[model samples]
Target: AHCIGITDRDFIEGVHGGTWVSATLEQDKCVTVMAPDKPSLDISLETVAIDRPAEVRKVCYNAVLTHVKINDKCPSTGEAHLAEENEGDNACKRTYSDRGWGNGCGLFGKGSIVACAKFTCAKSMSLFEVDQTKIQYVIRAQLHVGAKQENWNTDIKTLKFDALSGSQEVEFIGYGKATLECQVQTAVDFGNSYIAEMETESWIVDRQWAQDLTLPWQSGSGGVWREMHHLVEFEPPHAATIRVLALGNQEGSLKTALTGAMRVTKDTLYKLHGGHVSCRVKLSALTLKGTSYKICTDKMFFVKNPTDTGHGTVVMQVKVSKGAPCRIPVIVADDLTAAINKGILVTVNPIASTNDDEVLIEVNPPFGDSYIIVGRGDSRLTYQWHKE
Candidate 1:
């Protein structure tokens, strides 16, 4: 008879052997013993460095342990037992009976803990090796067992640590006050949105003085005015600064900023005289009557008497033979005025005429120095012109 104790049993050999074995040390009994090797436990640390101050840190690994169990079963009982001493026990007998007791049993038994041997004997170690130089500012570290047989073991272990040093500093230059102005040159109606048709002018106020400003105009009423006061602020005498001018039209708006020193000054104006002109006219004679008449003349007449005022005058004279009821034509000059001055004064009168002969003439002045001819009745007529 063979007696097997739970603690003293050779679990691997008993569960994997083809035949049952005796453990009581009696005659006609043979025992085979097998035990799994002790698993190696390893520990390691990895270091990583992040290039950028704001960059995130991460660590990953792929380490696993393999091959740690015996694969065999007792042939007589057809039982899968880890302990060799329990090969012929009731439990082993029942397992073999349920399987219809075969002559040969598979290497791996139902009671054999082969999978457990693999994991239990595995060497615990970090999957990745981080260099110390590369880990200057490690943000995070993670560890995990690879190729785990159990579902619960398929998880990662994570750890976080702070950086040892502070971040680098950043700098900017040239900060000061800025001014913006806009001017429009075309006609515009106020009904439309002024915000859409507006432009921007920007200048740096380096000195304590006002600057000249100009802007684009749209075809409408007065455009809208926008104020961007204190858009930026900084210490005086900076290397450079930027000013942005946002331009908007019915289509959309745009913003731009410039850098460096800028100086603004007021626009100066100098009065300009466009040009000058003198008025003149010619008088021609008609051959219809024995007496000659001023028939043709230039459009304008120059006033010689008023040379100081640069004024001009026009005169029309007409004559007809006695008993000849023919209408006479007379030309009149348009408004006359000094080249540089506005609102010029003009006077006209019939200074001379033939005896018992009466005539009528009309004076027309559309523009300065422009005139037309008109006939009213038959008679001899003359005109006198003067300027004050």
Candidate 2:
């Protein structure tokens, strides 16, 4: 353990192997990782670091993806192997690589103790072939470690994406989550949330955000209020990667109350990470279209809480627009009948109805859901159900 560097998080097989693994692990979730997430690692050192410390050459981080297997009647953690495609093909894909030696330290040992973490976009996860753990996520470690100290893992949507190389276009989605997150704040309780559209379009931009920045703020209370942190989901069907711009229709109470006639914040563009992106909106007021949205704990409307709850149950709520009547027929899959009888993830709680959306959505252990558009939308967002 000459030049050993380890993150206190104790991720992977650090202590057991006792070789030399160094890095930081941050960001995580439990659709078993449905949404997109960016977990960053910061570190130094390298293989053979133990061979010669001061004479170390370079440090690098390896990012690999694999589809592990888990079979029934097998030991909980054993009886697993790398999953392969149909006939015969490896499921693991080697991704971004990181290297360092004297990044900021210049050399020696006690330097800046920093190395630009490899930029690796974590993949989305899916529940495919899960009958008896026939398939599982590849062990990604903090995204490091050798055979001895390798444990942490991250998953992509499915093996179909052929993520090991990400040779083609890929997108990740889960219900209508990020939809509400992009609207409301996390402080407000939202058990479950939903954002529906009686109308779909390539880009039917609407106006619903707050915007009152009239007078000088009073520090903690006067500053533009932070609405909520949300995930931006949904993309163009034919789109590989798209640029998203959020100027938000400029018309709200705050927009009108601008002191120097300057409407809310300036517009900006962002990239969607792992099919989902976090959003935080702040304004002088919380009303939209001059109508104040309602807030409730058990049931919420329109915007989602963006926080995740670990429980699995039916928590759908909606609030109709007072002016424009919304008559959305509740669509239920015929398969739900069997789930209802079996009591799988089925149960409806009395919801709230003021204008829109969570079941703790924020309450869920890893709760959060929101909506978004890709490249100004083209055809409506459609789900690919293998419905012949």
Q: Which candidate's lDDT is highest? A: 1
Worst 10 residues of 1 by lDDT: 278-287
Q: What is the C-alpha RMSD of each candidate to the true structure, in Å?
A: 50.7, 34.7
**lDDT by residue for model 2 over 241-269, one digit each (tens)?**
22222222222332233233211111221
Off by over 4 Å in 2: 1-164, 172-360, 363-388
Model 2 RMSD, rounded to 1 decimal: 34.7
Tally clashes: model 2.
45
The candidate that achieves the highest TM-score relative to the unseen native structure: 2
After aligning candidate 2 to the native by TM-score, how far in Å is the CA of 354 from where it should be? 12
User: Which 10-residue span in candidate 2 carries the lowest summed lDDT?
Assistant: 47-56
Q: What would the per-residue lDDT of candidate 1 be over residues 1-388, giving only the tens digit for each residue?
A: 0101111211112222222221221112212222111110111111222222221111111112233223233434333444432322111111221111342434323322111111110111111121222223111111111111232122212221222233221111111111111111111211111111012222222111111112211111322111211111112211111122222221111112222222111223111111111111010110012123343221222221112212122222233234332323334443222122221112112211233333222132234334333333322122333333
What is candidate 1's CA lDDT for residue 40?
A: 9
Candidate 1 — which residues are off by over 4 angstroms? 1-65, 71-101, 105-388
